[PDB]
A = this chain, B = another copy of it.
Amino acid sequence: VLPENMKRYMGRDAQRMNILAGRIIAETVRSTLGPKGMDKMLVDDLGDVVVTNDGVTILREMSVEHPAAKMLIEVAKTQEKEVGDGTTTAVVVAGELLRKAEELLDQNVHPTIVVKGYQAAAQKAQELLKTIACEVGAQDKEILTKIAMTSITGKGAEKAKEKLAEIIVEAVSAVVDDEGKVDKDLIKIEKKSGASIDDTELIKGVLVDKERVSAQMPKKVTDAKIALLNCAIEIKETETDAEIRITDPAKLMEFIEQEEKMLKDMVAEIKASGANVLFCQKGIDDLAQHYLAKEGIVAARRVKKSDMEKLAKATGANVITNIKDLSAQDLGDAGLVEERKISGDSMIFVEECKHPKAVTMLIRGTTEHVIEEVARAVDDAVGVVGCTIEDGRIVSGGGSTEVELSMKLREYAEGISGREQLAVRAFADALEVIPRTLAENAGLDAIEILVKVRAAHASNGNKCAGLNVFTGAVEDMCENGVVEPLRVKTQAIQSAAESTEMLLRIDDVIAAE
């Protein structure tokens, strides 16, 4: 009936294999988690080497077979889309949550009771986080750099978190404009091996990976008047079936000369517009490039639609269809448009925009994998800054949240009573895996840290606690400026608890080959 190779699990075996598959992933990724966490090297079937610490990236790249591990990946991708970071922490706490669910299965607690206490504890956990949430200015320079920096830490880029925090806060502020909505698509991340991270810099405009089409064109244009054409700049022929019908040896020449005039006039109109920089989304015929050079118009063809839009946003250039339609009102401004070589590669830098809606960050470093890690670090840094601008609530780090939750959810458990108290107690205890693996990976005593931190948390509070693995002792995360967006923590609770309830609800898995 069934293909040899097909695997199927059901009842107790489905639940065991699903809890295992999820926790197995969590076991793999948790060794990267934290300031003292390590990195993974995944090399595909072609030799392509991926060196990263990002959990979701590891999950996307690695070869997963079990359906349960594949659903955990979907959770990781949601966390990636929403906030970027906190993916690993979502997997780990979910892995333990399943571990504790297995303890409840060992206790013969019916799956509907387990998920009942989890649903209850998760609802209260959300209320608790919103209660302890510290409100900050959405555009406050200070907290903007504090959120940025704490995000950057635990990465290779932390060594330069000061320059990066400035770059990312400035980049987001430049493109966000009003108060507000933050669109990460407005910040282009360019990465080019060569130099070091000290050379990484923000360019108020757009870095175009194109060259000056003619040797006769200027190499740099100041106070640039930029035009954006989406049509191809070639000798246009009608869509309809047509051909030249020669009537005289003179006319053979008249037709060729006529076509030369057509294309010459086109360029004459571009010049008449006041344009001196031109970007065409489609191709530009060499003959057109020949005429463009005559008027000193610098040009780049075959430009990506994405960059044509970044140019429109940054320069305020208006995309125009017909060259005859191009007017001064369509032209955008750039302080300087200049052709520059970066580690040999010739690019056109459009910089010093008046009021840019797009910004480009050029990342340098000694190796591709280094600038790739920096690219991931700053992607998350921008993400979490956007999270704190849109949602002006932050919370203390160093595991203070999860500890605060385990405190109040333990008392909540006692209030509930019955078999629900067992499930709620298990949920609250599951949250301690994060503080636990933070210290374990830090090389700190797992037991003594957890006892001292919880004691300090209960006595002094959640704004007077958490673990500072940097000095290797319990400290005050809040006063030390160790804070993260509320959204990170609240989204983790929601998605993890609901996807866990799903896994726990599945009692029959059929995996065809």
Contact = CB atoms under 8 A, between A and B. Distances in A.
Given A1-B63, A249-B255, A74 B367 contact: yes
A502 B215 contact: no
Nearest to A247: B245
Interface stretch (A102-110, A144-152, A164-172, A381-389): A102-110
A43 B258 contact: no
Interface residues of A, number: 107
B75 A49 contact: no
A41 B62 contact: no
A296 to B, nearest CB: 14
Nearest to A505: B39
Interface stretch (A128-136, A230-238, A452-460, A476-484): A230-238
Contacts of A40: 506-508, 510
B254 A244 contact: no
Interface stretch (A64-72, A332-340, A347-355, A394-402): A64-72
Contacts of A290: 321-322
A512 B61 CA distance: 12
A443 B506 contact: no
A107 to B, nearest CB: 7
Contacts of A253: 258, 262
A2 to B, nearest CB: 7
A81 B506 contact: no
Interface stretch (A202-210, A267-275, A493-501): A493-501
Contacts of A194: 78, 81-82
B215 A312 contact: yes
Contacts of A81: 194, 343
Contacts of A2: 63
Interface of A: 1-3, 28, 31, 36, 38-45, 47, 49, 51, 62-63, 65, 67, 70-71, 74-75, 78, 81-82, 99, 106-112, 156, 193-194, 196, 214-216, 230-231, 234-249, 251-256, 258-259, 262, 285-286, 289-290, 293, 309, 312, 318-319, 321-322, 343, 366-370, 419, 422, 440, 443, 446-447, 494-495, 498-499, 502, 505-513
